């Protein structure tokens, strides 16, 4: 089956944070968890990652935790918890970095981590089938529909979207060199 402790701890973290957003309001939690909006804040190191935990609607957190539990679960089960931790930490850091550049510091959501998992699971399952991981054609369809819809603003954090994807592809490429 699928139930890794990293998978579930991320799901719980996200839900705990989202409960807090509901009691305190978004901005209040945003003021503490969002990417540093002022260089003076730059040594508040949690912020480079914590933006990933914030969600701005129930639909967003469910949809994201679905993808996370599905693709995240698969990575933890087949490749270990350490691999899931690293993809998570790198993609959260890098998609937030790019996202801040694209449109400043007010954003959140696990969807950059998710696009990194999509990138990773797909390329890894392509170049390296024995990993026991793969992304289906229907889901890479929807992923592609999902990015470009963010371009055309019908998925708002585009730098996050494209950043995360890139990160997952690159790491899967690296990991698929090694066998």
């Amino acid at each position: 089956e699928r139930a890794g402790p990293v998978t579930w701890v991320m799901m719980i973290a996200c839900v705990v944070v989202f409960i807090a957003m509901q009691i305190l309001g978004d901005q209040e939690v945003m003021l503490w968890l969002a990417w540093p909006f002022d260089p003076t804040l730059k040594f508040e190191f949690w912020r480079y990652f914590t933006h990933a935990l914030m969600h701005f609607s129930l639909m967003h957190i469910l949809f994201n935790l679905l993808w996370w539990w599905y693709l995240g679960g698969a990575v933890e089960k087949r490749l270990g918890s350490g691999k899931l931790i690293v993809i998570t930490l790198i993609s959260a850091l890098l998609s937030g970095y790019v996202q801040q550049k694209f449109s400043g510091p007010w954003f959140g959501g696990l969807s950059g981590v998710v696009f990194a998992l999509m990138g990773y699971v797909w390329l890894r399952g392509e170049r390296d089938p024995q990993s026991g991981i793969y992304l289906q054609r229907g889901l890479i369809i929807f992923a592609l529909i999902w990015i470009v819809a963010g371009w055309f603003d019908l998925s708002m954090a585009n730098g996050a979207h494209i950043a995360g994807l890139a990160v997952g592809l690159a790491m899967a490429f690296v990991d698929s060199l090694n066998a």
Partner: peptide, 4 residues
Amino acid sequence: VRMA
């Protein structure tokens, strides 16, 4: 706010 943009949503990732």
